[PDB]
Amino acid sequence: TTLMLLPDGMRRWSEKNGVSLDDGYAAMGDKIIEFMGWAKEEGVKTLYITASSAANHGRPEAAVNTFMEAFTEVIRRCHSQFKFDFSGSLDLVSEDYLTELSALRDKSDSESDFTLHYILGMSLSHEVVGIFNKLNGKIPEMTEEILAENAYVPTQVDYIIRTGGAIRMSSFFPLMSPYAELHFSPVLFPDTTRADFDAALKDL
Amino acid sequence: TTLMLLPDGMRRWSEKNGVSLDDGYAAMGDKIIEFMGWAKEEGVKTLYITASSAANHGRPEAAVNTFMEAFTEVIRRCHSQFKFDFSGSLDLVSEDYLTELSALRDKSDSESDFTLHYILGMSLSHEVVGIFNKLNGKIPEMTEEILAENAYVPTQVDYIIRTGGAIRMSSFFPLMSPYAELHFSPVLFPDTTRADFDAALKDLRAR
Secondary structure, three states, X not given: OEEXXXXXXXXXXXXXXXXXXXXXXXXXXXXXXXXXXXXHHOOOOEXXXXXXXXXXXXXXXXXXXXXXXXXHHHHHHOOOOOEEEEEEOXXXXXXXXHHHHHHHHHHOOOOOOOEEEEEEOEOHHHHHHHHHHHHOOOOOOOOHHHHHOOOOOOOOOOEEEEOOOOOOOOOOOOOOOOOOEEEEOOOOHHHOOHHHHHHHHOOO | OEEEEEOOOHHHHHHHOOOOHHHHHHHHHHHHHHHHHHHHHOOOOEEEEEOOEOHHHHOOHHHHHHHHHHHHHHHHHHOOOOEEEEEXXXXXXXXXXXXXXXXXXXXXXXXOOOEEEEEEOEOHHHHHHHHHHHHOOOOOOOOHHHHHHHOOOOOOOOEEEEOOOOOOXXXXXXXXXXXXXXXXXXXXXXXXXXXXXXXXXXXXXXX
């Protein structure tokens, strides 16, 4: 099975705990690793994390770097513990981060039982517009299987967990996984315990 | 407030009532009209109903027919109360039904403040594959404005109501409406009451 995580609520968390937004994302960083561990402990093979929506990259580069850094620093630490890849609207990321995450991808465990995959710049519009502008004129007929091999999410998602209390998919719907089960948790992702995570998987 | 409804739970409904599938669909239609009305004095102006997925049109002809029939029968008796239109993977719909449903929008009240729009054969993969094949090699660059002109859902969706109790979008996610608020009601759609409707509308007008 494969699982997609929508880690949300890190700003609210920071304000709740009277801490800085950078510390909020640091808290997020820690639990992605801890969350990854739980995933390994219940049979997940691929864990997608929506690192960013396309619109989050239209913010000033200051605020964009802080979340790009916390997501990249997770990989800097445990890139031996899994196979790591990224995808998404990479034309909105900065050379600095695609170079470093390309680096960390080749470095990581090329034959583990587990892969951690970041989606960046997620937006269905962007995803589809991009795919079109890059196949346009080069193919006779577009098929589904060609669409699957170009979508931002290359596999089929079995389960999607969205934290932070919003009951909406935002820019993060996986274009080729219609049947994904949705689970919405009101807890801010830095406060996520395994109690709500096992609670999430008690859904059949 | 433009609203999309995903009417689900009619097959299950017929069992609870010991009736046949067609009656389940029959009651679905009856509620649509009744639901429509609530939507209309509740301030929604455009109401999308996910009539069918692309997968539902691979079913046996008789089965397709029965739900197609039931869906367009609502249109037949209520088309003067609203503006009707349809879209989706129409290449999957039968010739005869297209014709009729094209007929009924023309006879629909074009100067009405309310639009009831059926989405048929809905599936993002099918939607995107079709749009690409329509525009492959005939346009310079694709923009997001152009994609919206070609999406199955032409306006942006504010609220999505899914009955039938399943908590997933299935093939019904509206491609250009990311920020649509989602509401899942466990009520099987034929027994959806007005109370039910009201519940969902606050919950969604509170987020």
